[PDB]
Symmetry: none
Subunit: 26 residues, 4 copies
């Protein structure tokens, strides 16, 4: 869904989730 | 707290909260 | 400013791709 | 690369500042 209030929230979760997965592996 | 797992998460919440507040006003 | 709000989602995707590339190097 | 993880927080702050300036124009 490219409507901005869904898409922005999803991108923020992607950034946060990928950082946490990286940092746990690090 | 500038430790990365706190600071990154807080910047993400700032971006998301500021967007939602703006979009409600818009 | 004429930009649609999706510019924010697009920029979050772009920067998240930079973070992703950095994690993979590490 | 060898960048500190806080480069991510610093970049999120910088882009969040751009988003904030956009909200003020809108």
């Amino acid at each position: 869904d490219m409507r901005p209030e869904i898409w922005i929230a999803q991108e923020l979760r992607r950034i946060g989730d990928e950082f946490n997965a990286y940092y746990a592996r690090r």
